């Protein structure tokens, strides 16, 4: 079971596990809380840095991993542009908590 059982979910197979290794920060890539989940693949997500941004879903997670409101997310910022940016990796709740404990992200937002 993934979302709603279905006749049309057995033709997919998801492989990641709940016990997966947490992904760290990169260059031109940082952490965001989701302000409001917008339509058509767009999403309003406030970064942990201090900029408002406009986040966008790029492939991969577009159907595989569903997302909600107020989630800690990996965003690779546009190197040429700035206002439009893209989501790369969704973080789990446990994962988020671990990150918070570590102090890798700034302590400003709650899960």
């Amino acid at each position: 079971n993934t979302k709603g059982g279905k006749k049309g979910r057995r033709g997919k197979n998801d492989s990641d596990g709940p016990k997966r290794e947490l992904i760290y920060k990169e260059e031109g890539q940082e952490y965001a809380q989701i302000t409001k989940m917008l339509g058509n693949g767009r999403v309003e997500a406030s970064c942990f840095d201090g900029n408002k941004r406009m986040a966008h879903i790029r492939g991969k997670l577009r159907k595989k991993v569903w997302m909600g409101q107020g989630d800690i997310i990996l965003v690779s910022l546009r190197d040429f542009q700035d206002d439009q940016c893209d989501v790369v990796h969704k973080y789990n709740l446990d994962e988020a908590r671990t990150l918070k404990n570590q102090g890798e992200l700034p302590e400003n937002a709650k899960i």
Binding site: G41, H56, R58, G59, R62, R78, F80, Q81, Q84, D86
Partner: protein, 144 residues
Amino acid sequence: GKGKPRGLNSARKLRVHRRNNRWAETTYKKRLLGTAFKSSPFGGSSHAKGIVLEKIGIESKQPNSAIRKCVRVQLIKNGKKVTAFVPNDGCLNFVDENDEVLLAGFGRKGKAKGDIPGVRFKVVKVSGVSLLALWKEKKEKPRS
């Protein structure tokens, strides 16, 4: 019984009918209303040049994905804001803002290419150097 008139002295009417009908052929209408000059940023022209405002990486249409990379162009002749796509991989690293650039169509008689919405024009000659040449080493651009 063949709706169009077929008489020997029936000619004028026929001609007028044909004329009237012609006005529904889209191409003909485009040619004759002057929409080639009145509307459209490339006003009758084939290879308009302009300058870069913003470097938006426009997200593509469906079945496909990926961020596509385009350029906001202020045309030098008319001065309309234009969304124009840049060919090849990371040619954006040769464009830069406030740089003069020559543009072309898309083998589409106007319209838009099969993945990029809003985009109508290829960026072809960045500062009169041409992008293809830049891509395959060949020639170097004036920049500094």
